[PDB]
């Protein structure tokens with residue numbers, strides 16, 4: 001690995017978040033709690049901390065829209081891509097966007113797991129972290145990778161220990 005032309009990880013030990021828009025399927029307290037639990041699950045492997053702004057854009061703007069929006073790339077609604085985010089490096093960098101049209105769920109049985117999606121998107125917001133593993137927590141297009149329970153599978157650990165470490169295996173793919 002996940003090498004991109006964007007600074008992989010912010011230069012501060014603490015970052016900011018600003019949830020400009022919110023979903024609807026689950027309440028804002030659940031959005032903040034799932035963001036906080038997902039981010040605590042990221043911060044479980046790296047000593048990076050997160051805070052909220054008082055009056056200004058955060059380095060991790062989190063937003064939701066319902067089929068297209070005033071962004072670099074308009075959403076589609078129910079299908080295809082479910083959320084998208086940008087690599088960190090000030091400005092729009094690190095910010096993440098979600099399609100509220102797609103049915104969100106905390107983790108009950110059926111729907112699109114918010115804890116997984118937030119973890120996925122916030123991972124890119126942290127410092128990138130994609131892969132192509134059969135059960136990758138950042139796997140592109142849902143499949144085998146069980147979203148009900150992920151708690152940073154192997155892709156996340158490999159990304160984090162590749163970024164906040166060095167050692168890696170060779171593979172291509």
Ligand SMILES: COc1ccc(S(=O)(=O)N2CCc3cc(O)c(OC)cc3[C@@H]2C(=O)NO)cc1
Pocket residue numbers: 080081082083084085112113114116117118120121124139140141142
């Ligand atoms: C519920 O958790 C999910 C599941 C799927 C997706 S997604 O929107 O299909 N996803 C994978 C495919 C893809 C493909 C893209 O070309 C893309 O452009 C930036 C984004 C995505 C996203 C993604 O990786 N976002 O970081 C995003 C979050």
Ligand SMILES: [Ca+2]
Pocket residue numbers: 058059060061090091092093094095
């Ligand atoms: Ca930003």
Ligand SMILES: [Ca+2]
Pocket residue numbers: 075076077078079080081082099102
């Ligand atoms: Ca969609």
Ligand SMILES: [Zn+2]
Pocket residue numbers: 069071072073074084097
């Ligand atoms: Zn967008």
Ligand SMILES: [Zn+2]
Pocket residue numbers: 120124130138
């Ligand atoms: Zn991704």
